[PDB]
């Protein structure tokens, strides 16, 4: 979608190998939109969004509305016609399949990790969009650390130390006898 955007920015001048580089501009300068309708009203009316970027042989470009426009599709996969709602809404539905008691507890216990979770404007949008879903009287915990991306790697590095965790390391020696034919019932 963001590629399908900035072709509009005169780019008869784009490649396969540069999604990896759009992604860079994004990681440098994109942010999660805060108030999308009014974000668009502002984008339609202010130059203040617009900021420069630079290209390998000594070439500037400038960008600013695209920089939140594509960063709304998380709340609107429905932009493409994707059946997903805005994702925490889409998700909140499956939570509705469940116990009532949990709900303030899990609101007071929500946890974030992976690369793209780490964008600016995220939580200060999201809590207020999750607020658009929820029942009344909630209080929240948004466990979204710096390097939350790597926090999942580092938690496996701790887990590995647990003596309890070691207590059925699955060997080549099982497999040497077993072959493949029921490893999926050494699994559940």
């Amino acid at each position: 979608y963001l590629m399908k955007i900035l072709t509009e920015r005169g780019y008869s001048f784009v490649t396969t190998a540069e999604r990896e580089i759009v992604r860079d501009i994004k990681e440098k300068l994109c942010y999660v939109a805060l108030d999308f309708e009014n974000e668009m009203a502002t984008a339609a009316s202010s130059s203040s969004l617009e900021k420069s970027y630079e290209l390998p042989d000594g070439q500037v470009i400038t960008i600013g509305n695209e920089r939140f426009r594509c960063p709304e599709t998380l709340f609107q996969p429905s932009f493409i016609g994707m059946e997903s709602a805005g994702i925490h809404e889409t998700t909140y539905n499956s939570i509705m399949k469940c116990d009532i008691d949990i709900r303030k507890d899990l609101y007071a216990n929500n946890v974030m990790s992976g690369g793209t979770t780490m964008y600016p404007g995220i939580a200060d949008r999201m809590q207020k969009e999750i607020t658009a879903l929820a029942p009344s009287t909630m209080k929240i915990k948004i466990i979204a650390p710096p390097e939350r991306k790597y926090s999942v790697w580092i938690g496996g590095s701790i887990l590995a130390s647990l003596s309890t965790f070691q207590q059925m390391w699955i060997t080549k020696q099982e497999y040497d006898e077993a072959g493949p034919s029921i490893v999926h019932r050494k699994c559940f």
Binding site: I182, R185, K186, F188
Partner: protein
């Protein structure tokens, strides 16, 4: 010489077990030392602890035909770093004796086999078993 019945041999091999019967001239059997139990680990529902009451909760089979059993992991009480299931070896042999051989260990006599490098405890705990569970008249 006998209890009511004379001695017999089992050679308790760490691949296959072998044996025959009083009057024969061969091992009638040389057979897989193997047994199959589900260990697919989704331990769930209707929970209970600390109560050895009448069961609906066991799913197990023994011998060569236990090799066919699905999700049942056909383990081997052969000796191969696995040694601890000398616990199961009792119940296993109780099947063998009373249910495959279809025999009576308090009436016969016995001879059974061990490696040179054997430790005591695994045998000697089974000695109460040999003379209180199996309650044999004599063995070595």
């Amino acid at each position: 010489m006998a209890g009511r019945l004379p001695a017999c041999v089992v050679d308790c091999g760490t691949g296959y077990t072998k044996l025959g019967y009083a009057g024969n001239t061969e091992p009638q059997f040389i057979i897989p030392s193997c047994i199959a139990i589900k260990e697919s680990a989704k331990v769930g529902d209707q929970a209970q602890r600390r109560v050895m009451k009448g069961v609906d909760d066991l799913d197990f089979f023994i011998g060569d035909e236990a090799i066919e059993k699905p999700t049942y992991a056909t383990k081997w009480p052969i000796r191969h770093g696995i040694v601890e299931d000398w616990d199961l070896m009792e119940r296993f042999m109780e099947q063998v004796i009373f249910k495959y051989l279809r025999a009576e260990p308090e009436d016969h006599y016995f001879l059974l086999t061990e490696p040179p490098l054997n430790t005591p405890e695994n045998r000697e705990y089974t000695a109460e078993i040999m003379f209180e569970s199996f309650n044999v008249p004599g063995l070595y």
